[PDB]
Write a protein that binds this ligand. Structure first.
Ligand SMILES: *[C@@H]1O[C@H](CO)[C@@H](O[C@@H]2O[C@H](CO)[C@@H](O[C@@H]3O[C@H](CO[C@H]4O[C@H](CO)[C@@H](O)[C@H](O)[C@@H]4O)[C@@H](O)[C@H](O[C@H]4O[C@H](CO)[C@@H](O)[C@H](O)[C@@H]4O[C@H]4O[C@H](CO)[C@@H](O)[C@H](O)[C@@H]4O[C@H]4O[C@H](CO)[C@@H](O)[C@H](O)[C@@H]4O)[C@@H]3O)[C@H](O)[C@H]2NC(C)=O)[C@H](O)[C@H]1NC(C)=O
Ligand SMILES: *[C@@H]1O[C@H](CO)[C@@H](O[C@@H]2O[C@H](CO)[C@@H](O[C@@H]3O[C@H](CO)[C@@H](O)[C@H](O[C@H]4O[C@H](CO)[C@@H](O)[C@H](O)[C@@H]4O[C@H]4O[C@H](CO)[C@@H](O)[C@H](O)[C@@H]4O[C@H]4O[C@H](CO)[C@@H](O)[C@H](O)[C@@H]4O)[C@@H]3O)[C@H](O)[C@H]2NC(C)=O)[C@H](O)[C@H]1NC(C)=O
Ligand SMILES: *[C@@H]1O[C@H](CO)[C@@H](O)[C@H](O)[C@H]1NC(C)=O
Ligand SMILES: *[C@@H]1O[C@H](CO)[C@@H](O)[C@H](O)[C@H]1NC(C)=O
Ligand SMILES: C[C@@H]1O[C@H](O)[C@@H](O)[C@H](O)[C@@H]1O
Ligand code: NA
Length: 581
């Protein structure tokens, strides 16, 4: 194939193809041998060995000391302290058991997911496909089923793109740091104790074997690709050999070409192991606080506990999941939602209800979500995401709106996160203070009870503070409500209260991009719809300054501009920093 194992060659791969930007919402599942204990989290295989931990205490009381009853017993099977046989061994419904993967995939399809699939290998060394390179798999042991192939075939039967999640780097970069050393070479493979050159090779061989086996549309990767300092107390680079990373990228991108498919690979945002030229950044739970470019994704979970089922697990609400989805999509990302089947393969009814409720929302209001793109401002209102460390998912109300727009850039969707009891939606960024001319606003419509229904909004006025929209009669109840604003000849470019707007003509007209406070490089401005070489004017808000740089990313000659309108020489700007005075 045309890709070579170098950064410069692999950079040419299109990171986020149009189908992936259109998709918005996917579902995956942390289900595996790490679920067997149904205790604490999916990190149980690591923590069962940790000195003085709650997980070790539980393990020791339930099974035996971890030095005698090691993690490998969950895969190969053993008796617990009360003489019960314990093993990861889901039994198909068609064989009289409780594991019904077809039913689960129908539920996932019904949720509105446009991509779906399993965690194929987490950090615990167990590959869930029929693997020649790793004997630690569910065909050799346990259920005698190729779980990954079963899931993949069902996902394709149900007309969703296939995502496969792979977390196999941390396996040998510290996950099993507390497991006893072993001279059993097979057990060393499970526990990440092989020589590092062999482990680096195995990281690649696992990816290669899996991706040739199921032809994934997306390969999702966890951390420890090159994330020094993120592997706790283990002495090591918290990384995969660079050559092996590059060989993976070239192999997968070449296979995509061979298959006639536009493929995607994701990696954790903070990790340095891949580049954002060719791989999609996957933000920590909650996502970014701001609108980020280029296109990115984040993962979330129904569970309010761990990623994998545990006894006593608590869940978040349908509302939180839907509001979270709208938030991520408005900020130029996708949301990949995790679900948590029990060790036996049963999906709990509380999770089914959440998925059903997301699906009801998307079936009805999908026009505002699928196939849309972010505006230049993600939303308005008091309820926001902080970023950094996740506490609880976003839940908004009638005070909050999130924006999305169509590909033609003449329809703005204004999604309000509750029904306003005052029957008013006020859009600050379309008010007169926003320097927005609404002469071109042709229609304002409320999306109705079923997709394709529109109820006209008759009354609206533009104050200084906002476009003030009076709602018609409330439609059937929903978790959020959608207004559709159609403009002749393109959505107006708002002026942020503190921020700037850049334009393709010299007089603050033409194509434009609104900018908040922050830093905006050539990639940002280009993706937002205005290559910086084409900027010919800028309007800087009161209380704000803008610093223009000639370089791609805040290097080269710079010029500071205060509040007002300013002409800009063609080809003079590469990047911009917008700051509060
Ligand atoms: C995709 O991946 C790529 C690759 O990993 C990511 O690219 C990296 O992006 C980084 C963030 O933009 C970028 O880092 C910036 O580099 C600038 C240039 O550095 C080079 O030149 C300078 C000057 O010679 C050298 O000193 C330097 O060592 C480099 O060789 C730096 O200038 C940037 O530093 C400034 O910003 C950071 C915040 O990112 C501050 O912590 C820092 O103190 C600096 O702060 C000033 O400037 C920023 C403007 O960026 C202002 O916001 C801030 O208020 C400070 O303002 C003072 O100074 C400015 C003049 O600089 C003045 O106008 C102002 O009034 C103030 O006096 C920063 O370090 C990496 O270089 C880049 N890497 C590569 C390989 O490209 C990319 O981000 C990824 N994409 C996404 C979406 O994540
Ligand atoms: C005090 O403050 C100062 C100033 O902030 C701090 O200095 C900074 O310290 C950084 C850490 O040392 C230093 O970054 C390093 O810079 C070198 C030179 O550019 C760079 O090579 C380093 O990158 C390697 O190492 C990191 C950390 O593990 C990896 O994430 C990264 O992938 C690189 O790994 C490659 O090189 C390693 C050997 O160094 C190999 O072991 C590794 O396998 C890997 O090799 C592969 O990749 C190579 C290409 O990357 C390839 O050639 C090779 O063949 C293999 O394929 C790292 O970024 C900053 O430069 C430095 N800043 C300044 C201004 O000095 C200082 O740390 C502070 N002190 C304290 C106590 O905190
Ligand atoms: C494992 O093999 C090494 C090398 O022969 C040996 O030193 C060590 O004692 C062995 N481990 C055990 C538990 O016997
Ligand atoms: C919506 O949430 C905001 C922020 O917590 C709050 O100030 C406002 O009163 C809420 N509105 C309603 C109707 O509860
Ligand atoms: C999605 C989460 O990513 C983290 O890096 C992992 O360590 C967790 O177990 C989980 O898979
Ligand atoms: Na690219």
């Amino acid at each position: 194939g045309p890709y070579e194992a170098t950064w410069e060659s692999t950079d040419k791969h299109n990171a986020a193809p149009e189908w992936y930007r259109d998709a918005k919402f996917g579902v995956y599942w942390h289900w595996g041998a790490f679920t067997t204990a149904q205790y604490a989290s999916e990190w149980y295989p690591r923590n069962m060995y940790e000195p003085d931990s709650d997980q070790r205490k539980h393990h020791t009381e339930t099974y035996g000391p971890p030095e005698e009853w090691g993690y490998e017993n969950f895969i190969k099977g053993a008796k617990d302290k009360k003489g019960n046989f314990v093993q990861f061994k889901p039994v198909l419904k068609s064989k009289g058991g409780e594991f019904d993967p077809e039913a689960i995939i129908k539920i996932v399809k019904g949720s509105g997911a446009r991509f779906a699939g399993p965690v194929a290998e987490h950090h615990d060394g167990f590959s869930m496909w029929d693997s020649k390179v790793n004997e630690w798999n569910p065909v050799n042991y346990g259920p005698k089923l190729d779980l990954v192939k079963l899931w993949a075939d069902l996902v394709r039967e149900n007309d969703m793109k296939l995502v496969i999640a792979m977390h196999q780097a941390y396996n040998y970069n510290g996950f099993f740091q507390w497991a006893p050393k072993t001279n059993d070479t097979s057990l060393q493979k499970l526990l990440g104790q092989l020589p590092r050159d062999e482990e680096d090779q195995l990281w690649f061989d696992k990816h290669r074997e899996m991706l040739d086996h199921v032809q994934p549309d997306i390969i999702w990767n966890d951390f420890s690709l090159d994330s020094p300092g993120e592997c706790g107390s283990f002495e090591g680079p918290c990384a995969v050999d660079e050559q092996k990373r590059l060989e993976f990228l070239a192999y997968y991108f070449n296979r995509g070409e061979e298959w006639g498919k536009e493929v995607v690979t994701t990696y954790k945002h903070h990790d340095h192991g891949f580049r954002n030229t060719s791989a999609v950044d996957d933000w920590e739970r909650g996502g970014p606080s701001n609108l980020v470019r280029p296109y990115w994704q984040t993962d979330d979970a129904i569970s309010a506990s761990s990623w994998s089922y545990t006894v006593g697990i608590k869940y978040y609400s349908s509302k939180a999941m839907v509001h979270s989805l709208l938030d991520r999509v408005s900020k130029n990302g996708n949301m990949l939602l995790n679900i948590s089947p029990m060790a036996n393969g049963v999906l709990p009814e509380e999770q089914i209800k959440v998925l059903n409720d997301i699906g009801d929302f998307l079936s009805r209001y999908g026009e505002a979500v699928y196939d849309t793109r972010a505006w230049d401002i993600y939303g308005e209102g008091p309820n926001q995401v902080e970023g950094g460390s996740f506490t609880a998912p976003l839940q908004g109300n009638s005070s909050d709106i999130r924006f999305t727009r169509n590909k033609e850039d003449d329809v703005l969707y204004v999604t309000v996160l509750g029904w306003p009891e005052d029957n008013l939606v006020s859009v600050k960024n379309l008010g007169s203070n926003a320097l927005v001319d609404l002469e071109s606003l042709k229609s304002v419509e409320l999306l109705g009870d079923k997709a394709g229904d529109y109820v006209k909004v008759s009354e609206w006025e533009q104050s200084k503070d906002a476009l003030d929209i009076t709602l018609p009669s409330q439609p059937a109840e929903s978790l959020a409500y959608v207004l559709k604003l159609t403009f002749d000849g393109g959505i107006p470019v708002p002026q942020p209260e503190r921020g700037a707007a850049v334009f393709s003509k010299a007089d603050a007209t033409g194509k434009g991009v609104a900018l908040a406070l922050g830093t905006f490089d050539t990639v940002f401005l280009t993706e937002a719809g205005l290559k910086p070489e084409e900027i010919r004017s800028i309007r800087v808000s009161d209380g704000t300054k803008a610093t223009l740089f000639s370089g791609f990313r805040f290097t080269g000659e710079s010029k500071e501009l205060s509040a007002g309108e300013h002409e800009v020489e063609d080809g003079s700007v590469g990047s911009i920093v917008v700051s509060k005075i």
